[PDB]
């Protein structure tokens, strides 16, 4: 009732502010309600800005990939299909 | 009361006051030595915490 009258009056007298608050409101709410924000984070972590310094192999590192391109290690196959 | 009551009270008071004086001199000397050396629990001015140092592979190999 009162909200509808206020919004109709707002968009009839000051339509500029109505759009700005709507656009500003979406910019705060939508990022939280999105499944791609985590992908945006992962992409930033994925980019290798600095050298991947190797670690000395003590023989007890099963998952650490002592190799050029053997299967062990993180994969960017998710980004390829994005 | 008897003359011995004041006698013993005076002895106790003298013991307490002499202990206080000796402790005050001892405290002054201890504080002076701690401030001069900084090897005691007092006058321990803070230094940089070593837990802030980042012991991780940096960008340049020479660290």
């Amino acid at each position: 009732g009162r909200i509808a009258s206020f919004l109709k009056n707002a968009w009839a007298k000051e339509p500029v502010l109505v759009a700005s608050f709507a656009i500003g409101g979406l910019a705060i709410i939508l990022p939280s309600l999105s499944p791609y924000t985590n992908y945006a984070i992962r992409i930033n972590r994925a980019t290798p800005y600095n050298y991947p310094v190797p670690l000395r192999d003590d023989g007890n590192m099963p998952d650490v990939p002592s190799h050029p391109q053997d299967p062990q290690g993180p994969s960017l196959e998710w980004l390829k299909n994005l | 009361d008897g003359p011995e009551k004041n006698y013993e009270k005076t002895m106790a008071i003298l013991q307490i006051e002499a202990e206080k004086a000796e402790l005050r001199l001892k405290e002054l000397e201890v504080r002076r030595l701690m401030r001069a050396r900084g090897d005691g629990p007092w006058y321990q001015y803070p230094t940089i915490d070593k837990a802030l140092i980042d012991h991780s592979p940096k960008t340049t190999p020479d660290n």
């Binding site: 290798p48 991947p52 310094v53 190797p54 670690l55 000395r56 192999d57 590192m61 650490v64 990939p65 002592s66 190799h67 050029p68 391109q69 290690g73 993180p74 960017l76 | 307490i16 202990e19 206080k20 402790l23 005050r24 405290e27 090897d39 005691g40 629990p41 321990q44």
Partner: protein
């Protein structure tokens, strides 16, 4: 794949002091046992307690 962290199996010994650091100074003595009240309270001039 060229950005992954790899294991390197070497034989050169791991450096013991890469920074050539000096001997760390001996820390101050650390605390003591339980607490007891001050001998005669606060020994501040005429205050007996």
């Amino acid at each position: 794949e060229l950005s992954k962290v790899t294991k390197v199996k070497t034989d050169r010994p791991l450096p013991e002091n890469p920074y050539h650091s000096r001997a760390r100074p001996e820390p101050n003595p650390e605390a003591e046992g339980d607490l007891k009240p001050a001998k005669h309270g606060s020994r501040l001039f005429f205050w007996t307690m």
